[PDB]
Amino acid sequence: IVGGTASVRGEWPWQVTLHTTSPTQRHLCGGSIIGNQWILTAAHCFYGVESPKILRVYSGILNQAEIAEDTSFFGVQEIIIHDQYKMAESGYDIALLKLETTVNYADSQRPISLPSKGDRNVIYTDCWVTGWGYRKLRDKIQNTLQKAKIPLVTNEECQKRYRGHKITHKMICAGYREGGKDACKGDSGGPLSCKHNEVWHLVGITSWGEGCAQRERPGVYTNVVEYVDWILEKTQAV
Amino acid sequence: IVGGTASVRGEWPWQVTLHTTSPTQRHLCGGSIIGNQWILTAAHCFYGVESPKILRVYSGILNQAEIAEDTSFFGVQEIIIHDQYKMAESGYDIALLKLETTVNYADSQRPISLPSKGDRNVIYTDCWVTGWGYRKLRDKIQNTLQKAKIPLVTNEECQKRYRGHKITHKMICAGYREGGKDACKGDSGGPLSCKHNEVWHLVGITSWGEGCAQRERPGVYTNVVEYVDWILEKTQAV
Ligand SMILES: O=c1ccc2cc(Cl)ccc2[nH]1
Ligand SMILES: O=c1ccc2cc(Cl)ccc2[nH]1
Numbered sequence: 001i002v003g004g005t006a007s008v009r010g011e012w013p014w015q016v017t018l019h020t021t022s023p024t025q026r027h028l029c030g031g032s033i034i035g036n037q038w039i040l041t042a043a044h045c046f047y048g049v050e051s052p053k054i055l056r057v058y059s060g061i062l063n064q065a066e067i068a069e070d071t072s073f074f075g076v077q078e079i080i081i082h083d084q085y086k087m088a089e090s091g092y093d094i095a096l097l098k099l100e101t102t103v104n105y106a107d108s109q110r111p112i113s114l115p116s117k118g119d120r121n122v123i124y125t126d127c128w129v130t131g132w133g134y135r136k137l138r139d140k141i142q143n144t145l146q147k148a149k150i151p152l153v154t155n156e157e158c159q160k161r162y163r164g165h166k167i168t169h170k171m172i173c174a175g176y177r178e179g180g181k182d183a184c185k186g187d188s189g190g191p192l193s194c195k196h197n198e199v200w201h202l203v204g205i206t207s208w209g210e211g212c213a214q215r216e217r218p219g220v221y222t223n224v225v226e227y228v229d230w231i232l233e234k235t236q237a238v
Numbered sequence: 239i240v241g242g243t244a245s246v247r248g249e250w251p252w253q254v255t256l257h258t259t260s261p262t263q264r265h266l267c268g269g270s271i272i273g274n275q276w277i278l279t280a281a282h283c284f285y286g287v288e289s290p291k292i293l294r295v296y297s298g299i300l301n302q303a304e305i306a307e308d309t310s311f312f313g314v315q316e317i318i319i320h321d322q323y324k325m326a327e328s329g330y331d332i333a334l335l336k337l338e339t340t341v342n343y344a345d346s347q348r349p350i351s352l353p354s355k356g357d358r359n360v361i362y363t364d365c366w367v368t369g370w371g372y373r374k375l376r377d378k379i380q381n382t383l384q385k386a387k388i389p390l391v392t393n394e395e396c397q398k399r400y401r402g403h404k405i406t407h408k409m410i411c412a413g414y415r416e417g418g419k420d421a422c423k424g425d426s427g428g429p430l431s432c433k434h435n436e437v438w439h440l441v442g443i444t445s446w447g448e449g450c451a452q453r454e455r456p457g458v459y460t461n462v463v464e465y466v467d468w469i470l471e472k473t474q475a476v
Contacts, residue, residue, distance in 0.1 A: 023306035024263045068261035140378045 002213035003181035004148035014112035030190025039097040041189035043085040052076040060108035075100035088208040115225040124194035133186030148181040150174040175218030184212035240451035241419035242386035252350035257294040268428025277335040279427035281323040290314040298346035313338035326446040353463040362432035371424030386419040388412040413456030422450035
C-alpha cells in the first residue's frame, strides 16, 4: 500500500495473508474471508502455482513477524479460478480458495459480507484498500498491515485514464487524481472494503494498475458484485 | 553489493550464505569456508541470535532461488564470537561457525586460504567484495551473487574519512574516492578476497560503513591477518 498507515490490530478481520512455501516461505497475495471454508482473492496470484499444497493461509495477522514455523495456518484444498480468466488487465481476476479446515470466527477473524445487487446504485463514500504490499513500485513486503482510504472513480473516468485498455463494468476503479495513495505489488487479491450503513462490504478485489499511486492512474479492482452468482455457484457442495 | 555484477557460478566457491529460519527462513549474512568444519564470518551477524539451531549454511550457491525446503545445508553446532567483540564499529567483528558435519570439497565449494603475516607488506591490487546484499541502502536481498572489484585504501586515508571513529590496525578499508562500489546491508560476514601470485586470500571480512557506496566513505572490513592466531586457537580440538 502506498501512502497508507499502519492498521489497528484486527480492524480488517476478513483480511488474510496468502503465503507460498516454494522455494522458501513468503507472502504471495492478500485475500478475504467470505465463508467458513472460503477465501476470495485474485486469479492472477496463482501464476506458476502448480499445486495448492504449497499454499498457506494466515488469518488474524497484523504483522508478518507473527508468522513463524510454529504459527497455525489454513491449508488449501482447492484453487478455483474463473474459467474466463486470462490476465488481470482483461478482467475476471477472481479466484476462490477452499480451505482444508473451517475457520472458527472470532474478533480477529470473521467473514466480510458480499455486496448486494441492490447496492449497485449505492455511492460508497468510505472505501479502504489494505495489505502488506510495497510502499513503492520497487520495494518489499511490509511487516505491518497498511490501510489507505481511497475514493471510487466512475467507470467513465477510469476509462479515460487507461486509453489502451477496456475498463469493463466487471471492474471498479479507485484513486486520487493527483495519485499518492494506492495498492501496489503484494496487495493483489486483498479487499477493497467499503463501509455502508454500518456494515462492511467486499466491493472490490485488488487487481492491477499502471505503477503504484501515480497521478491519473486509478487502481483497478475486480467488481465483486458482478460475480456474486459465480461465487454462489462455486461455493456449493458437490 | 552496490555497483557490482552477477558472478559466474562457483567463481567464489568459499562464499556461503548464512540463513536464519526464525521466524521464517531468510538470508542473514555472508561467510567464507576456511576449513572442513569452519566458516569465518562477522560477529555482528548474530545480534539477537540466541541459539545456533536456527542457523543454516548453504554452500555452492549462485542464486538464492536454488535454496528450497529440499536443498541440502550445513547445520551449526557452535557459534564462536571474539570475546572482545562489542560492535562492528569498534572492531573485533569476527566469528567462527563450527558446522555439524564436514564439507566435502568440490569445484563449487572449497576453502579460501588465510592471509600470511609475511604478506602484510603485500600491496593487494586485485580485491573483490561479494554477496547477496542490497544494491542500495534501502533495498532487498539479491537473487544472484554479486561481485565488485574494490581498491584497498590505507588506514591513514580511511581514518580521515571516519573522523568520529577509531580506524585501528585490526581493520582494513576499501573503496573508491567517488564511491559507487561497496558492500551493503546483507553482505556482512562475507569475504574481501584478494588474488595474489595466482592464489586467493581472505584479506577481510565485510563489516561496516556509513551508508553504502557513498563518496569518501570506504567500506570497513575486519583485517583477517590480525586474527590468524585467534582462528588457530579457536579451531583446535577440545
Ligand atoms: O504494481 C501494481 C500491482 C498491483 C496494483 C493493484 C492496484 Cl489496485 C493498483 C496498482 C497496482 N500496481
Ligand atoms: O549498511 C551497510 C552495511 C554493511 C556495510 C559493509 C561495508 Cl564493508 C560497507 C558498507 C556497509 N553498509
